[PDB]
Amino acid sequence: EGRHMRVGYVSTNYSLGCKADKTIKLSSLSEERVLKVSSSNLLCLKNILEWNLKHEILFFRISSNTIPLASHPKFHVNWKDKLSHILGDIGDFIKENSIRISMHPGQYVVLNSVREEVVRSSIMELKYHADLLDSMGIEGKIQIHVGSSMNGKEESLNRFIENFRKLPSNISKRLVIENDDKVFSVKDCLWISERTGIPVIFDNLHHSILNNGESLNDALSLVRRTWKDRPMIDYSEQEPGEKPGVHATTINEENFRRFVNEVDEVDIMLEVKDKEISALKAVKVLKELNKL
Template structure:
């Protein structure tokens, strides 16, 4: 059995939350990316815009290297990181393409990403990307498909420059099935993806339309990322760890350890009478909130029943935590449920004590 890992997504949160906003901004900003806007770039000369964009890119490459250095010092079971999609602002935008084609800038990117890849490999950090929901490969609008392919290939370029993408799932780049054409749309654009993109792409079930069953229609192309929170919302129930579809998801990874995504609805549910130790039943929730209210992510993994449920997948899946407190949420979960005594959850969620993160 390979090592089970838990990871966090994109941003670093400093553990001393009682510091001033200025202090937190300085500490966290050194590890987090910056960006700019096309509106601002249009308001200044091309030279000023280019200089600013280069400063942003240089900062972002250094910041992600610092973030990787931070993750490299964590226990091996926590060395899993989703890199930010915002490292190279407007990389896939036609109006900015000339900036990134400049040989000096291209050399800067190759060097910076090569260092990031080397740090990750030496520290055995499992890496991923997750292009935003505007990456709609299954759209029925050709211009949207073209832009989405460009955006996905932007991520593939970063993956390639880090030294990944040469073989199946040495790096995960995850998207939702989205757009009116859905599965058929994905199949129609598949030949247009680069080999790096096809080696790294995964398809994740989402909460609204395209669920687990839709993703399983694409397992001949790519692995399925099981999001248990999305599945719960989409199907109004928790997918059982022994559901036959889970075995099919695992098989889709072709021997690579699968990854699943894990989040919880907002802690505000506690104020509505849903206790941290309580199983969150959809019927009861929908009496007081709408489904849309359940889409957002919590700051921490506050519901202990759901934590115990998620732990039942950890023997077969690495888990990417999607929480607002990023690394702090993963650290708290790790300390309580992985390092701490797991005996009280050995028999499943019904045995969870009234503890919480």
């Protein structure tokens, strides 16, 4: 057993002055603005991925802002054709250099909504995520939360299932779900996976905060079963003494050992404000453990 764990971080790299998560405001919407910001995000993303490889960070969560406002209903810009060259170039690199990709389209995606409008708009946002990834000629996972709780859980869960079951292939095939710190725990997520085949992503912090008494190694074991290929997870840490769920501004290098050491054969996304810096710490610990 050589490698088997990848490390990633999210959206952009601060230590590089090359923002890849620039968006724009509806008042600016036009073909020119969209292309300009889309090109600069993508030029930076190439760079960010070149730097990641250089520093043995082969996992990355792509910003949803990459093509700003792409899902907005007033948005009608043919970014797929215009930007096809860069987009292909970034994908070829991702695949040539064995990089894992994910996206996390945000909180406005409630696929189990009671309001149809929000379902349809949720699907458009997912559509953009899938379109982006195809445009790079890559697979990738799109992670989301189960969504709302209205009318209690098992209706909510079924609203999720019924809707999931209706999505187009090339969204559903990328879709994985994450456990949260309020409503839907892992046990719930598994409930869904069992009925859907949806891969579950374990967010460690949301789980130590909302569990049914599953120990880390028990929880992992069950999730693993929901993945065809190699599981992803989200690793975050608490910000000391806050109303729990607040992401630490960086990772504690010891907490990370304790954790990564009861685990192999997964890729880890780091959810912390200082982004690449924690990625570097994460790369140290694993290099040390021969698990990178």
